[PDB]
Design a protein around this nucleic acid. Structure first.
Ligand code: NA
Lengths: 121, 126
DNA sequence: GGATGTCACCGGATTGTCGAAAGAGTCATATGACACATCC
DNA sequence: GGATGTCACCGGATTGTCGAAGAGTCATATGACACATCC
């Protein structure tokens, strides 16, 4: 169907995901500096029943479950990230991933990127 | 799909089935005096019993009206082993296609009975 | 030997029986009705 | 509530696995394959 292209950051703690002003965009050698902008969206799960650590999935701006929102729109579960010189345009030339055809890229960030307590690179 | 209208006469003895002239046509209340003519045909089968040895069973003679059955092609009297002919006094020598044979799916066999007095060989019983 | 059926136990197998949309071996999947759990 | 899946054991379920795509139970139905029977 539709996936985030970039695995997920797991929230082992209680604090939400947060990034300094130019940090948090997953590395993707197939993308350009213009594309480095998007959002993480939270998804939690309950599995005798137990809620599990939330997963934050990244989606480029204009794609995914919140493709309608513009950068900055305030909504719970949504946090926004951008690299300095990215353009505020929908990234339809990137879109989402079909897991049938494509495995997720293991999400890593440039060495130095600061994470909250409950998250690991 | 095609069978005899009647049950079979079982040959328990050694002599084949035989009838005096004018005897041996099975009773059938749906038939007319013109139809009372046909033949008995012999049928044997050998089964494997509990012994495991193969074994022949007493032969069965099945009646078929003239012009019907496995020997519908034969005319009355034709000499063939296993085939014997019978006819009543004033029967007609014509094929009995209006009687035909029986489909066991739609019709049970009539128990074969003969008019009381009919002479049978020994290995046969009314 | 070469096709066709595979139940019972020759009573009547050219039937009777237990079931049945009739047809009847074994054994391994396939289907389909039905229930509940899960996901949105 | 009203569609949709029923596996594993949350690693990655927004996947991986074993077997061949999809994954519950349970009752028949089918079909390939061997033997017995019938002609
Ligand atoms: Na004829």
């Amino acid at each position: 169907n539709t996936a985030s292209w970039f695995t997920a950051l797991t929230q082992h703690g209680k604090e939400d995901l947060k990034f300094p002003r130019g940090q948090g965009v997953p590395i993707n050698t197939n993308s350009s500096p213009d594309d480095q902008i998007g959002y993480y969206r939270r998804a939690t799960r309950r599995i005798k029943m137990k809620d599990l650590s939330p997963r934050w999935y990244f989606y480029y701006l204009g794609t995914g479950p919140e493709a309608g929102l513009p950068y900055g729109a305030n909504k719970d579960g949504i946090i926004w990230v951008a690299t300095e010189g990215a353009l505020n345009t929908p990234k339809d030339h990137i879109g989402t991933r079909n897991p049938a055809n494509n495995a997720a890229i293991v999400l890593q960030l440039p060495q130095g990127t600061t994470l909250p307590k409950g998250f690991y690179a």
